[PDB]
Amino acid sequence: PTYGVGHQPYRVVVLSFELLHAPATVCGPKKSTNLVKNKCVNFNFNGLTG
Amino acid sequence: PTYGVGHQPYRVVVLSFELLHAPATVCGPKKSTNLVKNKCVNFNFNGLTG
Amino acid sequence: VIRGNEVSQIAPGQTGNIADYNYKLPDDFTGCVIAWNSNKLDSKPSGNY
Amino acid sequence: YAWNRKRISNCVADYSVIYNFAPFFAFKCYGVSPTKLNDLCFTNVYADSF
C-alpha cells in the first residue's frame, strides 16, 4: 500500500464482440414490432438499419 | 469518503461563449492604440486581425 | 489484474512485455476495455503474492 | 529556472529499465514511440530534470 499510483493494483475486464455473421443471440431491450410489406418503411433487422 | 475513485463527487463549471454577432463586451487589459488611415497597416478590431 | 505501467499496453497493435508474452490483442479488435483501481481489494501490507 | 542538463553518449541504452525506477503512468513521446525505442540508434541524448 506504500507504493505510488504507477504501481497500484488495477483490475481489467475486456469485453469482446463479434460483428454479426451469425444469428444474433445477445441483444438489447428494444421491443420488436410486427412486420409490414409492400410499403416503403424504415426497417431495423438486428441492428441493420435502412 | 470510502467509495472508489469512479464514484467520487466532482465539481464542474462550464463556460459558454458567444462568437461575435454583437458588440464585444468581455475582454482584458490589452491597451488600445490610436487610429491611422491610408497606410498598409496591421489592424486588430475586436479580436480580428489582418 | 495487472500493474500500473501495463494499462496502456492492452491495445491493438502494441508491443511491450505483457502484450507479447502474456495476452495479445488482435489489430482488428472491436470491443471495450475497462480498468479500475483495486487498492483495498488486492493488496496486503506484508505483500500480495 | 536552473534545470540540470546531462549529456548521455557512448553507451548502449536499455529503455525497459526506466519503468522500474519511478511510479509514472506512461511515456509521452513525440516523433518516436517508447516501445520501438530499443531497436534504433541515436547520436546524442540529453536529460533534464525539474
Curated annotation (Swiss-Prot), chain C:
Region (Integrin-binding motif) residue spans:
3-5
Q: What does this protein do?
A: Attaches the virion to the cell membrane by interacting with host receptor, initiating the infection. The major receptor is host ACE2. When S2/S2' has been cleaved, binding to the receptor triggers direct fusion at the cell membrane. When S2/S2' has not been cleaved, binding to the receptor results in internalization of the virus by endocytosis using host TFRC and GRM2 and leading to fusion of the virion membrane with the host endosomal membrane. Alternatively, may use NRP1/NRP2 and integrin as entry receptors.
Q: How does it assemble?
A: Binds to host ACE2. RBD also interacts with the N-linked glycan on 'Asn-90' of ACE2. Cleavage of S generates a polybasic C-terminal sequence on S1 that binds to host Neuropilin-1 (NRP1) and Neuropilin-2 (NRP2) receptors. Interacts with host integrin alpha-5/beta-1 (ITGA5:ITGB1) and with ACE2 in complex with integrin alpha-5/beta-1 (ITGA5:ITGB1). May interact via cytoplasmic c-terminus with M protein. May interact (via N-terminus) with host bilirubin and biliverdin, thereby preventing antibody binding to the SARS-CoV-2 spike NTD via an allosteric mechanism.
> What protein am I looking at?
Spike protein S1
The source organism is: Severe acute respiratory syndrome coronavirus 2 (2019-nCoV)
- What portion of the full-length protein is represented by this chain? 401 to 449 of 1273
Curated annotation (Swiss-Prot), chain D:
Reading the lineage from the top rank, the first entry is Viruses
Explain the purpose of this protein: Attaches the virion to the cell membrane by interacting with host receptor, initiating the infection. The major receptor is host ACE2. When S2/S2' has been cleaved, binding to the receptor triggers direct fusion at the cell membrane. When S2/S2' has not been cleaved, binding to the receptor results in internalization of the virus by endocytosis using host TFRC and GRM2 and leading to fusion of the virion membrane with the host endosomal membrane. Alternatively, may use NRP1/NRP2 and integrin as entry receptors.
Q: How does it assemble?
A: Binds to host ACE2. RBD also interacts with the N-linked glycan on 'Asn-90' of ACE2. Cleavage of S generates a polybasic C-terminal sequence on S1 that binds to host Neuropilin-1 (NRP1) and Neuropilin-2 (NRP2) receptors. Interacts with host integrin alpha-5/beta-1 (ITGA5:ITGB1) and with ACE2 in complex with integrin alpha-5/beta-1 (ITGA5:ITGB1). May interact via cytoplasmic c-terminus with M protein. May interact (via N-terminus) with host bilirubin and biliverdin, thereby preventing antibody binding to the SARS-CoV-2 spike NTD via an allosteric mechanism.
This protein is called Spike protein S1
> Organism, per UniProt?
Severe acute respiratory syndrome coronavirus 2 (2019-nCoV)
